[PDB]
């Protein structure tokens, strides 16, 4: 037969399923055909985005001295970043709460 | 003689408490009953999953809170502290909901 | 001599410009600005004749709709003069500023 | 039986690679899976529209990179595309 099989994710140096992304692109009929490098690029971009979001969430969680990431930390990490907030501008997160902030005029003076 | 808090400063403690927390604020049973009552007109004898009603709770609460953020902006703009229904209406109009 | 009361010619201009549908921004300065702003993104860019017209006409509609919203903010604050804070708050509520 | 495809294991793997001493809740994992699916759908739809732009019936890395550039705002895009390029320039290096 053939040699020992090994996943395309290992070739691309990712742990995201480039094969599953390719299958989803094929079965999602976005285009008649999909290139070989398109699933690799999509998996890499998804990996980078989720890595940044998870790193910010973990940083917020360790700030709140809570080592388990809960949905509350996700908004604290996403909305505190302007670029990520712009990316998720029309996105609501369940059990995310709101950012603690009060308008300056509402605060009492000296 | 009894201890009394000056008005307007308990509201700051309340604002901090409800902004720090993340749980639901509307009671679950009245909201579920309202959802059934408003959906029964579109299709009689309907059925909702437990997650279906809860999903409507999170969507409604996020929308209502976000609207109140914009409503406060309008009320603050008019050089006042309280919020009027006209603040809500103008916030909806600028967003494009009631244009 | 004759002199209109300050504030009535403004309604005349409002009615004249709302009834009409021409382009209120001079075409050559807007095209020059478009070329300058697109020069930074990619040098040596050519613009179609109808590309700039679409760019300017779409840009004009956004500004006009923005001024409708910022006019609403001015009246809501019990005024008639639109101010920079009116534009800023209208943009913030619209979701563009933040 | 009745298996359900999800990005849970991959999200956990990248979480452990970026923070080797923390956990994640089930609801947080579901939110992350939904976010990954939504971003995948958005980028793939933009790539499909860009393919339909130039009467092209195929999807390549070029237009998915262009779609990522269009979608992701500011510095984020300048990162992501670069990352994507890496994942390609080594993929063709070793087969």
């Amino acid at each position: 037969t053939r040699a020992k099989a090994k996943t395309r994710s290992s070739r691309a140096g990712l742990q995201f399923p480039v094969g599953r992304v390719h299958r989803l692109l094929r079965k999602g009929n976005y285009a008649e055909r999909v290139g070989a490098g398109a699933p690799v690029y999509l998996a890499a971009v998804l990996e980078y985005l989720t890595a940044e979001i998870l790193e910010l969430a973990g940083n917020a969680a360790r700030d709140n001295k809570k080592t388990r990431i809960i949905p509350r930390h996700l908004q604290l990490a996403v909305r505190n970043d302007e670029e990520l907030n712009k990316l998720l501008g029309r996105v609501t997160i369940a059990q995310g709460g709101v950012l603690p902030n009060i308008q300056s005029v509402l605060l009492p003076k000296c | 003689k009894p201890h009394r808090y000056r008005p307007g400063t308990v509201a700051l403690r309340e604002i901090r408490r409800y902004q720090k927390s993340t749980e639901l604020l509307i009671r679950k049973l009245p909201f579920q009953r309202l959802v059934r009552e408003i959906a029964q007109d579109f299709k009689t004898d309907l059925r909702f999953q437990r997650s279906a009603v809860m999903a409507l709770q999170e969507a409604s609460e996020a929308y209502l809170v976000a609207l109140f953020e914009d409503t406060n902006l309008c009320a603050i703009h008019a050089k006042r502290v309280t919020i009027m229904p006209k603040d809500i209406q103008l916030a909806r109009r600028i967003r494009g909901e009631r244009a | 001599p004759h002199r209109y009361r300050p504030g009535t010619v403004a309604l005349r201009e409002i009615r004249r410009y709302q009834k009409s549908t021409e382009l209120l921004i001079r075409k050559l300065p807007f095209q020059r600005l478009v070329r300058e702003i697109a020069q930074d993104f990619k040098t040596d860019l050519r613009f179609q004749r109808s590309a700039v017209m679409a760019l300017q006409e779409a840009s004009e509609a956004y500004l006009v709709a923005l001024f409708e919203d910022t006019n609403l903010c001015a009246i809501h604050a019990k005024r008639v003069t639109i101010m920079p804070k009116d534009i800023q708050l209208a943009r913030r509520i619209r979701g563009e500023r933040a | 039986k009745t298996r359900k495809e999800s990005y849970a294991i991959y999200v956990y793997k990248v979480l452990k690679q970026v923070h080797p001493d923390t956990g994640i809740s089930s609801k947080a994992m579901s939110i992350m899976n939904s976010f990954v699916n939504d971003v995948f759908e958005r980028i793939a739809g933009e790539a499909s529209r860009l393919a339909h732009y130039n009467k092209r019936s195929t999807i390549t890395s070029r237009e998915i990179q262009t779609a990522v550039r269009l979608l992701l705002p500011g510095e984020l895009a300048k990162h992501a595309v670069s990352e994507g390029t890496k994942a390609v320039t080594k993929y063709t290096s070793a087969k």
Binding site: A51, N80, V105 | - | - | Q17
Partner: peptide
């Protein structure tokens, strides 16, 4: 900074914070 273990380099050092315009 940023990075961390297997994510050396990459990421987004010094990300832009939210503005939260005040009236």
């Amino acid at each position: 900074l940023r990075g961390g273990l297997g994510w050396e380099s990459s990421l987004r050092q010094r990300p832009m914070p939210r503005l939260t315009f005040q009236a």
